Amino acid sequence: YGFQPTNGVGYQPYRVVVLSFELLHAPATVCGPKKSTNLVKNKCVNFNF
Amino acid sequence: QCVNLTTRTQLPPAYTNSFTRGVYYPDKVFRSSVLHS
Numbered sequence: 401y402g403f404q405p406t407n408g409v410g411y412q413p414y415r416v417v418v419l420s421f422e423l424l425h426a427p428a429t430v431c432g433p434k435k436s437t438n439l440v441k442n443k444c445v446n447f448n449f
Numbered sequence: 450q451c452v453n454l455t456t457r458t459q460l461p462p463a464y465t466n467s468f469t470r471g472v473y474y475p476d477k478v479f480r481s482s483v484l485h486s
């Protein structure tokens with residue numbers, strides 16, 4: 401590419417980043433930041449592990 | 450610093466029989482008496 405500053409759009413350079421989330425078969429890894437309250441037992445509950 | 454070690458041996462390698470070896474768990478997934486293919 402011979403890029404030059406006086407190029408019409410669609411010929412100017414764009415930077416690209418491709419994030420690819422993969423899930424092999426480990427025990428866990430990085431994730432978003434939730435809260436992580438606590439835990440309870442012997443009650444019908446709505447859980448996220 | 451490395452050495453010529455290899456002596457030429459006329460004998461070929463032998464062959465044995467792997468009766469039932471080399472089986473692994475292809476996941477970290479718990480199963481309990483489930484016949485899995």
Ligand SMILES: *[C@@H]1O[C@H](CO)[C@@H](O)[C@H](O)[C@H]1NC(C)=O
Pocket residue numbers: 453
């Ligand atoms: C043995 O080592 C010498 C150097 O010490 C090397 O010139 C020669 O190629 C080696 N022999 C073989 C068969 O590679």
